[PDB]
Amino acid sequence: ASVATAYLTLKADQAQLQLTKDTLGTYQKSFDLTQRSYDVGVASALDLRQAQT
Amino acid sequence: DQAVSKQQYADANAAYLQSKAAVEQARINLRYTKVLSPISGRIGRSAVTEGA
Numbered sequence: 001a002s003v004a005t006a007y008l009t010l011k012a013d014q015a016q017l018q019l020t021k022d023t024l025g026t027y028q029k030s031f032d033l034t035q036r037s038y039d040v041g042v043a044s045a046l047d048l049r050q051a052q053t
Numbered sequence: 054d055q056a057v058s059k060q061q062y063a064d065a066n067a068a069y070l071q072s073k074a075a076v077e078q079a080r081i082n083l084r085y086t087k088v089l090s091p092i093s094g095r096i097g098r099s100a101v102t103e104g105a
Contacts, residue, residue, distance in 0.1 A: 041059035 027051075 034051040037043040090096075 044058040044061075045055045 031051040034043055034048050038045065038048045
């Protein structure tokens with residue numbers, strides 16, 4: 001029972017790791033667009049600091 | 054310090070310039086009602102008196 005629960009938590013936690021890597025990708029793309037709109041001048045620096053947080 | 058955008062600074066500058074234009078037109082109508090001499094010269098008599 002303990003080896004089975006360890007393997008199931010290992011598979012589920014590396015799936016969780018993959019989904020957090022994908023959310024990191026989407027947040028990085030959103031900060032890339034906010035830094036792009038900050039250079040041009042549409043977005044103020046408050047939206048840039050919110051995307052950076 | 055870029056704490057607001059350059060775009061809604063251009064919007065606020067536009068609202069400022071348009072309201073200056075409105076004050077300028079109201080000041081044109083207020084520099085009327087005291088009918089200045091259009092050219093310098095010798096003036097005749099008032100065909101339209103006080104009160105009319």
